[PDB]
């Protein structure tokens, strides 16, 4: 499986695949990995729907009860912190992509934020513009550094995510790429100065539609 | 990956997706693993692209050595017989055949259909279809349901296309049509006249109508 | 063995074989397996006499003790998250399959629901309208695929699920066909608006005699 | 798997199942597992059908080797001689059943022969009336034992025979039992002082429906 | 060593050989593996004399201890649920449990068999009858040509005893009647009078005329 | 299993069980493992009924072997060395034991012999009267302790060695005790001046019957 | 290390870096991985210089002995067979890239050949336009799989090749990207109907230098 | 990776490499490794970006801590004892800390820097420099021809930057300078003026300037 | 213990150390690992006196065979063939470093050889103008990286040398340094047009002293 995650100007992009495999068999077509944990965050995990579900749902009830108590939000930093907290003592098998906007960032249009966290258990602040966990991983970085010169906006940053997913899928069997005939496509949250937002699946299908369309 | 092999009346049909993989990775979109070995028959092996054609190579090299020496091919049981030798030599994947023989006292019944299990044994089918390979369940289930549907050699080429297309639906291992690239399962059909290969175009167009089906 | 469930419009339908093996030997053949664990749900598990019948006792007097102690049940997100905890707290061996109906979904025809859990103890709320756990698990998911558009009500989804059944057992030796010597069928449990039921064992006779005289 | 051998007077009868399993799944229903040997033997092996068919074939080469080497056939105890040094040689796994008529005993009644091999390879004349190999052989035998006595001729050994069968399947999951939904049933040779002969498929039919009908009347009285 | 217990007409009945062996050697000749252990129960365990006996014990001090406590008997599924919680406890030597249930509807019926798998595991047994132990294949299919003849206690013992001869005719680990030492398997039935021992003197007569009859 | 053998004087006596088991089951009811090799000799295997008549007849036929080539039998040390070279051989498992009467030999009286081989193939003459082989020989053993004394000749020689049989079998589960519900007794072989002789099975049954009577 | 392949329009590419590593140390910085092994293949092995120097020797002296031999070169066919018994015969390790012009082809803008081995040791003829081997290859693939189209000539051929190169040097520390420092770079063959013949070191040189300028 | 420090009259240097790896694959082109820890130190730790910074962050939480309960700093033997137990206490991967000793009596060799062994030991470095990592002998080597050119800070942060270099040519787990992507080294120089952080330019200028000295 | 090899305008040199140690023990501290095997060649091994001498007696061995045979002797291309079989002969250990001049080459001030192999048995012939192997030769090379500037001929060549394997020795516990108080010092090789001779232990003796005096 595999979770991308993009900074464009103006805000950040994480997209996720669709599939779960039990080795060599399909066991999921529609599994959300994606899920919005805060106004300006969002987990990804190249795992099973419940270890993406749980996950994020332990991470946003953890965001939230820190606001309710201290009446205001963790600073980026500090939500970063409870994540790298959670994360190790977890390990004490797959991985967290975290994408953020810092509505506390001196610069707007880079304020969009990416954190990965390595096979220890460390974090790491993605400064190269993208990132990607999961076993179709190198091949939707590979495509990414080829199309990256390309995001200006959020739209366009949205559509490298979508064929970043399908560049995965293409080589990796154990990442699921667009199913036109069931209609299931990957998910994706994108993340401004206005909170984080569920990408409607319409939008994912088009952008799905137009990239097999381009490479027929 | 994924080999189907069914009889219909009057003949035999064999046919094989296009993957290869690498643990999780995509190494081949075009792998051919059906290849015709003689007048009468056609073996498939669920491998990589070697090891099917340098398998039927060396099998069609033998069967031919047996005509050019005594004259006269061997009988289907002498063919499975070679067949069986050449395999447990071997383990010292499995391939499936599918022949027709020439020589049966019902043509229409004279389609066969030969597995071979882990310890190199062999087995002539009797339920009419067999499958080899990761998504061979997933084959045969979808065959069993559809195989009534088998009345010729044309719906038995679209039950052969839809069982691998039911297979690559629930194993990744297993290849779909690629309607982006217009790679499609290769297949053999074998009857009284012989052996021939199915022509690209009639397994797009059913491959296209299962897609439309299922849509 | 194998256990199947099923989702029809206005329910769902969760059935179960009576077999049970020691490598070889059969060694039971009246196992029951699923069972109603409250007024809307039921629970199925793939394993012995005991490990069904334990879990499901343990499971419905959870549901019940929270319904005594708050006055109301728990929603239905929070029943799978109780047996989420329980199946997790025993992977400290045959994962359930549970089958409801969510008395408080807006749309009562699809209010129909099959929860499975993956070997890590992971929920999935199945999306795809069938589900099958077992040994005989992909027979029945590859029987109901071909089978699942004949599924207008309570009574085509019952026979379905039968159907699965027995193609399972004709597959897996481990999974028991119906046994007409004995009179020996498999169970099945039956959930819509006014609750779930005990499908009596006379309609799964005549629905498996239906089916064994169209295939001889 | 099951196989089993009876004798009976004047004669001996060899039944063998038609499953073949991979783990739990049922891989084949359709595996001969006994076959003819020359005219007056046998074997059965519960193994796979590629197994049952070569063990017989190379065994078959054997024996009818020897009469056009020699101008006769081997004498019994030759026979299982042979038998005895192909199955330690391929000791290099399922170990086969033989039945056999001899005859040139001096008693034609008693002139079946069943013979069994153990794991290490060593061969047993059966004198206890019957033997069964295979996952299902304890079944199999237990069934024998109940209902021996009732063998008095051909007919009624293929029964009894029939019957073990449908035992073993019934406490056996690796064993198969008569499928009346596609027609399968277990196949079986009768061996007497005429030779060996392939029963037909519509007496182990009927048999086998009949063992069902009975089986379900008992079951309702039962209850 | 075996243990068989079979439902009949008003009851129940549990009997037991007399066997313990090491390896290949005779250590008991004399091992009581059956006991009473309430007024409605008995518990079998195929294991050596201090197994059985120990089982038993801690068995009939629970269900007593509960009585007197809170002044009436568990009901029958109170009582497999504590012989499961102790079981599971040990694991963490499969009992079989024989009883009669003096609140059920139907009392020609309400005798109960209740097994133990692998795993601790319970398993009321439906079927008329069930054995556990190293001959309980070979007593279990005795029981199964032989049932049919169970029509009271008397007729319940016989088959019983008949069981338990066939599993040491098969199984070198289960005693056969001793007929030089006067040793006989033992036995409990169970009907709406309560569990009671079986003599030893109608088990000998038993064992007499099965022996006599397979001479 | 059990194989036992004595000298009385004149001669000697070997006497053997009749079971075969494999794990806890019973096998084989009917094996013989003792078997006459020439005029003056016997073999006893405590093994498969395959594997103590191959032994003995690949020894009968080397022993007639060489009296056809070179005219005359070989001595008694000659057909021990004969017989440890077959041992070792078949070391490169269950160990024979044999029962002679050499006819060269000066005292007639004591002329019957018993030679026993050790787990690494090394022959043995016995000297202290007995021997046994087998699962149940130390219960053999003993219980010819105590009775050797009362051996004058070949009947209370066989009678010892069918009651050390009948105790080998009393306290070894391997071993097998007389079958009288069968009508089946241990085999024996009895060699003198006169030649090596089958015990008829009406004598063992009378001893065996003997001394089943007197021990109730 | 990594060696590419592409076709172009009229012929076929192949290069290599010049890397070797014993572990993280970098023990090479001129290794020559590509050779000419007759006058229409080169071969290439992704490992040290001697294996690669050393199999690609063997295999011209096999192409040009059946030459002398026979009168007439092998088939293509024929030279991927020799190859294949000869790497076959070595994995009783590293695979080689053939690439090759079959002078015979009916048509000569197609009549590049591109033959991989995988690790059992088995042919592929590669229909996809280009390949990769080694430790970079999957970075390489996925650069040339979006630089391909851009592959009109010989020229743009080098360029895509040299950039795949590129690029699997900046993903793999295994590959050895351009040294400017000491003037190192990859090396490559070209062959077409006129002939394989190796690329001067400056064009890749040039080639290089505004790849560099370009990601600048 | 690669992390290199040296003593300098009036102080002490500290850089290490960008580079981060998982196998051959390179997963990190900007991380840093060094960090100062309070007004007169910096750790270095040859790992991920994660640990390097998660234990800078805990030993100077630590050194503040005490300032804040006892009203002055630890004396430097204070920081390297807090530091040890804080290395030791995670092995029940290694740090190199550079600090200068405002409270030693010779101001100009008052530079400090000490290394962890295997087992979790301290050691006060007294050659002049010292290195940790995948590249640490190829540049400790590379400081032993180039130390005698140090006089100053300024010449000590351009043997620091050259050793780094030096690492990078000879181990492919070390970084070296990215002039496509204007990565370098990163580096912190301690005095009797407290610790601070090298501005990146002034490392660029001196890796162009080795970069153009060699070529 | 190490060997280094460097090449200077009109020739090579080799040097090894003299220690040989049995684990912390010192064992030899005369040993001699460079030896001239031909007129223009010399091996040296990082491991034991017999090792050394006896590798290098073969392989000269070897050499002047084929001098006798044919006339003339080999090419250098077939010298290093002709050690390699002999390397990868004895693999199926410490590794040969061999210095040569080839006397057909064009460029005499670049005739000068040098040939390494790695732990597999595969050849290098090293282009970076010196090698070093053994367990000092990581600090020996690391040494002549900052010292190969200054050699300008036979003599600066020989003190870089010497000057490499004092650094192994300052560095390695398991090289020796010049020995004054036994008047040990490293052995030396030094090949140009006119041959191989052994340099005077006296030369090395005050190239050393200058090395110990000027780092005093």
Known sequence: X?????????????AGDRRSTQGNM??????????????????????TAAVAVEFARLYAVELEHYEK?????????????????????????????????????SDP????????????????????????????????????????SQVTDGDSGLRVAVEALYDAADDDSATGGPDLVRGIFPTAVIIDADGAVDVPESRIAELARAIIESRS
């Open 69 to 105: 108590l201290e009446g205001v939000p963790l600073t980026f930093a500090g939500k970063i912190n409870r994540l790298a907290i959670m994360v190790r003592g977890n390990l004490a098998l797959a991985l967290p992509l975290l994408a953020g906007y810092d509505i506390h960032a």
């Open 109 to 148: 249009q880079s304020a969009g934020r990416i954190v990965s966290f390595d096979a220890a258990g460390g974090w790491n602040i993605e400064e190269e513009g993208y990132q990607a966990v999961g076993s179709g991983s190198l091949f939707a970085k590979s495509s990414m550094k080829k199309l990256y």
């Open 26 to 47: 399909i066991s999921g077509r529609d599994v959300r990995k994606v899920y919005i944990t805060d106004d300006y965050t969002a987990t990804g995990i190249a795992g």
């Open 2 to 14: 595999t979770i991308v995650a993009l900074k464009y100007p103006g805000g950040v992009v994480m």
